[PDB]
A paper describes a structure:
In the present study, high-resolution crystal structures of MtbGlyRS and MtrGlyRS bound to glycyl-AMS were determined by X-ray diffraction to resolutions of 2.25 and 1.95 Å, respectively. To produce MtbGlyRS, the glyQS gene (with an N-terminal purification tag) was cloned into an M. smegmatis expression vector pDTCF and transformed into M. smegmatis, and expression of MtbGlyRS was induced by anhydrotetracycline. The present study describes the first crystal structures of bacterial class IIa GlyRSs bound to glycyl-AMS and magnesium, which closely recapitulate the binding site architecture of the glycyl-adenylate-bound TtGlyRS. The sulfamoyl group binds the guanidinium of Arg197 and ligates the divalent metal via its two oxygens; the nitrogen does not interact with the protein but instead forms a hydrogen bond with an active site water. In the glycyl group binding site, the carbonyl oxygen forms hydrogen bonds with both the Arg197 and Gln214 side chains. The amino group is held by the carboxylates of Glu216, Glu165, and Glu324. The configuration of the carboxylates, especially that of Glu324, together with the presence of the side chain of Ala326, impede the binding of pro S substituents, thus providing the molecular basis for the substrate specificity. In transitioning from the AMP to glycyl-AMS bound states, the largest conformational change involves closure of the lid motif, with displacements having magnitudes as great as 5.6 Å that accompany a twist in the central sheet. While the lid and glycyl-AMS lack close contacts, the hydroxyl group of Tyr264 is placed 3.6 Å from the electrophilic glycyl carbonyl carbon. In contrast to previously solved structures containing related ligands, the structures presented here also detail the magnesium coordination sphere.
Glycyl tRNA synthetases (GlyRSs) are prospective drug targets for combating Mycobacterium tuberculosis (Mtb) and cancer in humans. Structures of all three forms – complete, or in some cases partial – have now been determined using X-ray diffraction or cryo-EM. Both Mycobacterial and human cells express the α2 subtype, and notably, the GlyRS gene in humans encodes one product that serves both the cytosol and mitochondria, which has obvious advantages for the design of selective inhibitors. Similar to the TtGlyRS, the two Mycobacterial GlyRS subunits adopt the canonical architecture consisting of an N-terminal catalytic domain and a C-terminal anticodon binding domain connected by a β-hairpin insertion. The catalytic core contains the class-II specific antiparallel β-sheet having the characteristic insertion domain after the first strand of the core β-sheet, and the anticodon recognition domain adopts the HGPT fold also found in HisRS, ProRS, and ThrRS.
Author numbering:
A (entry chain A), B (entry chain A): 3 to 88, 138 to 342, 352 to 461
The structure:
Amino acid sequence: PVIDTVVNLAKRRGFVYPSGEIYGGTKSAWDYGPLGVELKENIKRQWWRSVVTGRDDVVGIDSSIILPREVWVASGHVDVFHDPLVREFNMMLKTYLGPIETEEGLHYLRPETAQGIFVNFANVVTTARKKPPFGIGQIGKSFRNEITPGNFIFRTREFEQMEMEFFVEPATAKEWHQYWIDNRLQWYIDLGIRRENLRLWEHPKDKLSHYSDRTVDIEYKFGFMGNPWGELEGVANRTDFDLSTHARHSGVDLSFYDQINDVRYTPYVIEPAAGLTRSFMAFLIDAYTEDDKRTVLRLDPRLAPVKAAVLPLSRHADLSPKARDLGAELRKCWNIDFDDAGAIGRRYRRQDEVGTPFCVTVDFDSLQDNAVTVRERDAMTQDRVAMSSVADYLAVRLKGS
Amino acid sequence: PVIDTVVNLAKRRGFVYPSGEIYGGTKSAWDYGPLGVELKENIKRQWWRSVVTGRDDVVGIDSSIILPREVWVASGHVDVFHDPLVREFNMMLKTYLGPIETEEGLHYLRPETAQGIFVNFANVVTTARKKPPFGIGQIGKSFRNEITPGNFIFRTREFEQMEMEFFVEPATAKEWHQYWIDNRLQWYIDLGIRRENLRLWEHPKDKLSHYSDRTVDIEYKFGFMGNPWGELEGVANRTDFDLSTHARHSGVDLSFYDQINDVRYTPYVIEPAAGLTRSFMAFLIDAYTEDDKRTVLRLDPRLAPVKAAVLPLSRHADLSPKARDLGAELRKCWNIDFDDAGAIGRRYRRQDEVGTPFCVTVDFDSLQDNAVTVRERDAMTQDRVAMSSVADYLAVRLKGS
Ligand SMILES: NCC(=O)NS(=O)(=O)OC[C@H]1O[C@@H](n2cnc3c(N)ncnc32)[C@H](O)[C@@H]1O
Ligand SMILES: NCC(=O)NS(=O)(=O)OC[C@H]1O[C@@H](n2cnc3c(N)ncnc32)[C@H](O)[C@@H]1O
Ligand SMILES: [Cl-]
Ligand SMILES: [Cl-]
Ligand SMILES: [Cl-]
Ligand SMILES: [Cl-]
Ligand SMILES: [Mg+2]
Ligand SMILES: [Mg+2]
């Protein structure tokens, strides 16, 4: 099973560790190791660039994990965010702030990042001077008391989301819903996930969250036992539910004033809400490849956690100086690895297994011509390149990182 | 008072908003607005590059906010992480995982990120193949039930830290403590904080945390009422306290085996632990400048949240096309702003107030020569540059972003 093989790879090479492994570990709680944090950050950079900073109609925020409790009463989560089990059980995590543990310092950890955006809608309109159609994007931790946490990092109690609320004139919501479904689906494909392992699934009206009139899920073919498909991201039409309920509960006008047409209306909201940690899982699974056999993690070079590995042909004291000066130069621009242990052939394979797009070998000939050998991960091609031109050579091939 | 003037600027321009402002707001809980999230991320990038990816002896991780409870018993936080008030009160925030609220699903939100590093020490040594002296760095949220939260974002219950644990041979700890004090102090100065507004303060032995044998604080002259200095970052020698106590409580050997010299020892730990949100506060305060008067936020261009502003001389329908094509081009590489509202003079000043290093004006002459005017924030100089060479012109001046 590819999924089991990929999970074991992730653990073995330090993409992830079980949180508190030495004490047993919380239920499917996971830490991200050296390779994992870089891959996770690279995914965040690509989402932020595509959804926020690369666009002229979206701005970002970073709201607090712990908001005033009334936020989650007004949003309705207090009332309906529960599941029956064996009695109804609310899935929000609780904490108590301040010196007294009275039900007065009670707060909820956010189960979604969306509400921190909604309650700031008027703030952002004011300081960013935005007019619908425009969006507010955010990446951060959310918390849910999942009853059956598992499937690796697919379903955890602590996870990270990448959510954007796109505020539009109500009569335009349907075409903007289609736009963002297509835009988000294509984001995964642009970053290397095979089109055939993705699909769209529309929620039946009885499977809609309390805030949505229509949700379309982007699903990935993870390879689970039974049904191998799993929700990767939800794109929902939340209409004016969220701004209306916070205006009603807070007493603050959250409508938008269209100065041009002197009209006041509450925008509708289209919301792409992706799972950072689930996308992490999907990119690894889809990249995994068993090509005289070879294991290759064929990650988009923009996502690969290590962009290049400097590998001296041997531990020889004459190779180290030139190789270490090169690594120091490349580290100014990218995350790179240095490895002189063992047969160079096994070191190539070690890098291929974690998706490193390029290996740079400093051999004995490098001391007479001042050039090195660059190996491409997928094709295993081999080009000889001037030491002073290696950074340029890699920059052209890592553009967008 | 500069500090009050800077706080009000931050709120007014959307560097920060009070969390849940429309409902009153948690005690000194703050959201980061469009400008703030970019500045915060830019600070994180500079720390990660300087402490982690730019070095050959440090790797990163991202451990969970919520670890197994036994982590915080073993660390001693359960026993001693309390302050007397009016009775001793533990300052860790609590939550309950799982369906039962018995004192069995009880967990603590981490009051520091360090413990997630320590319990993974053997994991990281294994998968990253590191040998002391080496470090493990991390950025993430921490939580403390501060009794008197205030001073803006200086002391909050939810905040972000940038911590690195540098594991060394015990006999080398003192010189590595000096190294990291100097390295961290200089990081702030390299990013533009005036040397005279920083100082070092050594904790008296009676003011040492339970895990440290010696702590030196980097303090910044925030301008508080009374004593204007405040802790910006702590660099502590935690000796072998943390690895020893987790080995003792978990039963897992967390020593390091030096294969070369066949010696087994528990490394000492030097720990730079910075406050992301406090550094955010310090960079704003120190950049604030009142130079015919002008208000300028003189942020290092690597930190500035908006790298360039595209400003058509007017709303004229002939300027928009060329200006919008330029903004679209620059957004491929940087966060940029577009503003055609009001007198160009006031738009320059609007950008200066938030530290934008460059304004790019598309005037009527631009349509006959296909060049634009670039204005430098600090000097207000003005250079005429070919449309097709603007990205190169800015890239050279934003290197390191
Ligand atoms: N704001 C709208 C919304 O929240 N919508 S959604 O509730 O559908 O979660 C949005 C995304 O968060 C991810 N996600 C959700 N729950 C979990 C979990 N327990 N573990 C990991 N990832 C998860 C998943 O990728 C899902 O598509
Ligand atoms: N691991 C070692 C350590 O934790 N050490 S330290 O406890 O000293 O916190 C480290 C840093 O976190 C920041 N910091 C601490 N508490 C707060 C707070 N309540 N609000 C904002 N920033 C804070 C501050 O910048 C401080 O220097
Ligand atoms: Cl756009
Ligand atoms: Cl404003
Ligand atoms: Cl180094
Ligand atoms: Cl390994
Ligand atoms: Mg869903
Ligand atoms: Mg301190």
